């Protein structure tokens, strides 16, 4: 299941360690395609039972951690990996599943 | 070659092509039946509070343009991915020029890789920007600028330092080529906060634009007009639709500015000029779903129709008569290009689950055997005495 | 403030199923009156829902010609009696409302168990007289259609019962101005001014379905979603993208080329591969010198 | 879903567009109201561009005929009244032809305000014999089909030709299904597929005023 967290969670979550990748659904609920979002990340994590976790966070509350992770518009997606040699990864727009499915394979 | 240009001149639009992507969200005001609202509640979607956003990409608003009968070329960078090429396609199809588009076979459309800090709290210092952020100033398509006799841009192409180089310099070439420069605020969702930070970063582009749109949100902000008015109540009170003064926005005023348009999506459009001065009321009571409700759709519409206008008849930039013929003419771009929105996303009951307004309005039987409304067995009746 | 104003003149209400309203319209171009006229006569007059009751079941009866001990009316009477009773909803869907009475008594339409999304417009309309305190349970079908049509019962969903206009000349011929009268009547399940208003509506739905983009336009919610669909299995079982979606756009012409091309509405590669070498010198400004350079490109591609 | 698509187009000429078009699935009676108002908007709400005065500079000496020109003021003024343009002026312009002598005078010598374009350029306005010089100062104006020595042109705005439409209709059993179909003819400043757009922003702009409101 999507969870909703703080910027608090966030922060003991990305700090902390895993074994899967992670994606952080940065939205608001005044945005119309974030909702679409919403459609496509259920999908995903169904397909992803535990080889994955999807949080979403909103961007209304924690708008000084949006803007810290440099968010410039919705809905943005972070892949973030448990590797910590790897760098994350930063989607704007509503991108089909299938550029999700690339992502959390070829370099997450 | 400009006896191969033809009419209407083309409109250079600048910027990113994304996809159903919201720069920021403010709580506005719509003018509204609200006898209608309550007659209708349990049939017509209502958002529990109005938050409009000022519009999309540059990519859009050619794709708008578009539509209208205009001539768009749209300027920008998409990487050879497939989402890159799907963006292409999209653009091809809509009528949108991409001669101007710079395929890059290096960056990754809409992906960018950061570097997220995990000793304090978290920052994000991007590394490799995506495909659209990466245009040159060699990647300038001079040919496009020579034709055009519009330059539209917006603050998203300032937010990169490497972009907004990009973004000046093609703003200067325009000048030179005498193309009149229109700048659509759009402010970005970072921006919003340190309005210090704001007035700094777009300054040198404010100072360049004969055409400036913000939303009346936006012109508060900038004005450092703190939001007196109420939000999300059953009323059309004047107070909330208010026209400013032309002193309020006189210390944004610069040589140069042509017209200032103050958007409050489609219910008010102002206008001002050196001399005149005025507004426009519109209708802002359209089919709104879930998937519509930022009302970004009609800021782009709204947009496209003030180009269309201004590029057809460009020596009436001060004719107050054609303002409001222009200013009604984008609020009714606006209203139409919501309306189309909200019947093809349709509403919630890449997987996507939408229905139709048809089936969003039809309730459930009631037929429950168990329920009153339903013929019982005669045991469990009780007759209702006359 | 606006130019253009429209409003109420008159809101009558003549009984509780009888609603009369006039509106006007003012000023309007020559014309405009006669467009704005007749299809807002034809949108109320032919285009706005109703909601009635479509059929009944009796639990004790023959057919519906007999008569039933202690109710003065027949059961081809009751029927009648239904189908007059004006109901008010938003809604689609058949629902079901139920009457389960005890006589003696009259039986109007207030006493009708209505689900919560359908209303009754008027209490006092009658149903039927039991002179013997009998139990009568009556179910009955409710749908919201437009035009018109267990026992059925033949309804007439239209709420508008009769529509007038008229055009009146607003003085000297500045513009040859024009002033639009509307009345309305209405069986009081939606008011003259809501009819008004939900004919605009249904003529904007009427006359928007051509400003959407034509049939067969994107490849075939997010009309981008399935090229890009596309795209992925054609690069598994790599077989390159037809020439119908390359654009010329992509290729690398001159800019003189390309706004001929783009001038005789030849926009994908296959359009111009179609085009002969005789066709393009037709062309204005696209001559002999620029075939071989172009068929070069093309030669290059 | 309700869509619409383009059956048949046609070019016959620079000044004769045929386009027919399709919109289905449509229920009973819905076809002949979009019918009847698309028609009705076709062939006055859209507006066009003609000319509407000439005036014959160098001071002709007001008669019917003029030295070097082989035809009359009137066919003159006849001819000039046949010339299709297009533009997206506001208010009134001015155009001129100044031609020095003898060959043919055509819409290609006409020299045009900003918007104003020319659709057929072989079109003629005159045949000059002697080498004088004809200077004829012409007012463009733009308007709705529905709406000093200088001669008036008796303007027919309407830059559709005709426009027709008819219905089909269908069934399988209980279920009907009608089709609607609009034929366009257009002068060529326009195309059939642009005048069908047109005309449904100009129906739909008539009725957006019956859901305004008042500021309180």
Redesign the interface.
């Given at each position: 299941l999507v969870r909703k967290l703080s910027a608090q969670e966030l922060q003991d979550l990305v700090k902390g360690e895993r074994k899967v990748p992670l994606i952080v659904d940065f939205y608001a609920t005044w945005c119309g395609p974030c909702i679409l979002m919403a459609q496509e990340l259920e999908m995903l994590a169904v397909e992803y039972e535990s080889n994955a976790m999807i949080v979403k966070v909103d961007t209304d509350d924690e708008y000084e951690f949006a803007r810290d992770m440099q968010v410039r518009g919705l809905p943005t997606l972070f892949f973030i990996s448990p590797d910590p040699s790897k760098d994350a990864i930063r989607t704007e727009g509503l991108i089909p599943l299938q550029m999700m499915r690339d992502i959390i394979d070829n370099d997450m | 070659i400009s006896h191969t240009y033809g009419w209407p001149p083309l409109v250079c639009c600048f910027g990113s092509a994304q996809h159903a992507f919201v720069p920021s969200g403010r709580p506005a005001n719509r003018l509204l039946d609200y006898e209608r609202q309550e007659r209708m509640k349990d049939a017509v979607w209502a958002p529990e509070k109005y938050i409009r956003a000022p519009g999309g990409c540059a990519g859009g608003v050619a794709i708008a343009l578009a539509s209208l009968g205009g001539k768009a070329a749209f300027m920008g960078k998409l990487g050879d991915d497939d989402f890159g090429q799907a963006m292409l396609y999209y653009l091809n199809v809509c009528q949108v020029q991409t001669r101007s588009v710079k395929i890059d076979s290096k960056r990754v459309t809409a992906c960018s890789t950061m570097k997220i800090s995990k000793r304090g709290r978290l920052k994000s210092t991007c590394v490799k920007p995506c495909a659209e952020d990466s245009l040159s100033k060699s990647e300038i398509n001079v040919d496009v600028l020579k034709e055009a006799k519009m330059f539209y841009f917006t603050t998203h192409s300032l937010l990169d330092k490497k972009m907004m180089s990009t973004t000046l310099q093609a703003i200067k070439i325009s000048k030179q080529l005498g193309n009149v420069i229109f700048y659509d605020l759009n402010l970005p969702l970072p921006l919003w906060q340190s309005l210090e930070e704001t007035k700094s970063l777009i300054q040198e582009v404010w100072d360049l634009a004969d055409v400036i749109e913000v939303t009346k949100q936006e012109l508060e902000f900038l004005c450092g007009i703190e939001p007196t008015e109420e939000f999300d109540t059953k009323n059309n009170d004047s107070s909330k639709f208010v026209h400013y003064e032309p002193e309020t926005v006189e210390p944004l005023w610069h040589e140069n500015l042509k017209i200032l348009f103050v958007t409050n999506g489609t219910s008010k459009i102002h206008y001002y000029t050196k001399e005149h001065n005025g507004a426009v009321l519109g209708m802002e009571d359209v089919p709104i779903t879930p998937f519509t409700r930022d009302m970004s759709a009609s800021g782009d519409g709204i947009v496209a129709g003030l180009i269309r206008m201004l590029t057809v008849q460009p020596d009436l930039m001060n004719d107050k008569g054609y303002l409001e013929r222009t200013a009604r003419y984008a609020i009714e771009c606006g209203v139409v290009d919501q309306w189309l929105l909200a019947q093809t996303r349709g509403y919630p009951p890449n997987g996507i689950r939408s229905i139709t307004e048809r089936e969003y309005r039809t309730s459930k039987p009631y037929d429950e055997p168990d329920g009153p409304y339903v013929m019982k067995p005669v045991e469990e009746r009780e007759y209702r005495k006359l | 403030?606006?130019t253009?104003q429209?409003k109420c003149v008159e809101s009558r209400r003549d009984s509780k199923r009888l609603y009369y309203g006039r509106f006007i319209?003012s000023p309007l171009?020559?014309?405009?009156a006669?467009?704005?006229g007749?299809?807002?006569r034809?949108?109320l007059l032919?285009?706005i829902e109703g909601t009635c009751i479509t059929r009944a079941?009796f639990?004790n009866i023959p057919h519906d010609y007999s008569n039933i001990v202690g109710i003065q009316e027949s059961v081809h009477e009751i029927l009648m009696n239904l189908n007059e009773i004006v109901l008010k909803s938003?809604?689609?869907?058949?629902?079901?409302?139920?009457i389960?009475?005890?006589?003696?008594?009259?039986?109007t339409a207030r006493?009708i168990?209505?689900?919560?999304?359908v209303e009754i417009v008027d209490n006092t309309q009658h149903i039927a007289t039991?002179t013997e305190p009998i139990?009568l349970?009556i179910?009955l079908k409710i749908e919201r259609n437009?035009?018109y049509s267990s026992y059925p019962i033949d309804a007439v969903f239209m709420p508008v019962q009769n529509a007038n206009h008229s055009i009146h000349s607003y003085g000297n011929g500045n513009?040859?101005q024009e002033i639009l009268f509307i009345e309305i009547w209405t069986n009081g399940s939606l008011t003259p001014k809501?009819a008004?208003?939900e004919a605009?509506?249904n003529?904007?739905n009427?006359?928007?379905?051509?400003?959407?983009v034509?049939?067969?336009?994107?490849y075939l919610?997010?009309?981008?979603?399935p090229?890009?669909?596309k795209?992925?299995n054609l690069?598994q079982k790599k077989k390159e993208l037809a020439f119908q979606?390359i654009?010329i756009?992509?290729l690398e012409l001159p800019?003189?080329i390309?706004?001929?091309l783009?001038?005789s509405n030849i926009?994908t590669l296959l359009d111009l591969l179609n085009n002969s070498q005789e066709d393009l010198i037709k062309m204005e400004?696209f001559h002999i010198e620029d075939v071989k350079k172009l068929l070069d490109i093309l030669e290059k591609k």
């Open positions: - | - | 403030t606006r253009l429209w319209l171009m020559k014309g405009q006669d467009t704005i007749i299809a807002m034809r949108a032919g285009e079941k639990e938003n809604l689609y869907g058949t629902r079901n409302a139920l389960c009475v005890q006589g003696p008594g009259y039986i006493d168990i209505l689900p919560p999304s039991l139990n349970c179910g437009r035009g513009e040859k809501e008004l208003h605009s509506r003529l904007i009427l006359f928007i379905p051509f400003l959407h034509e049939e067969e336009t994107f919610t997010l009309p981008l979603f090229f890009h669909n795209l992925v690069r979606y654009f756009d992509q800019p003189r390309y706004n001929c783009k001038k926009h400004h």
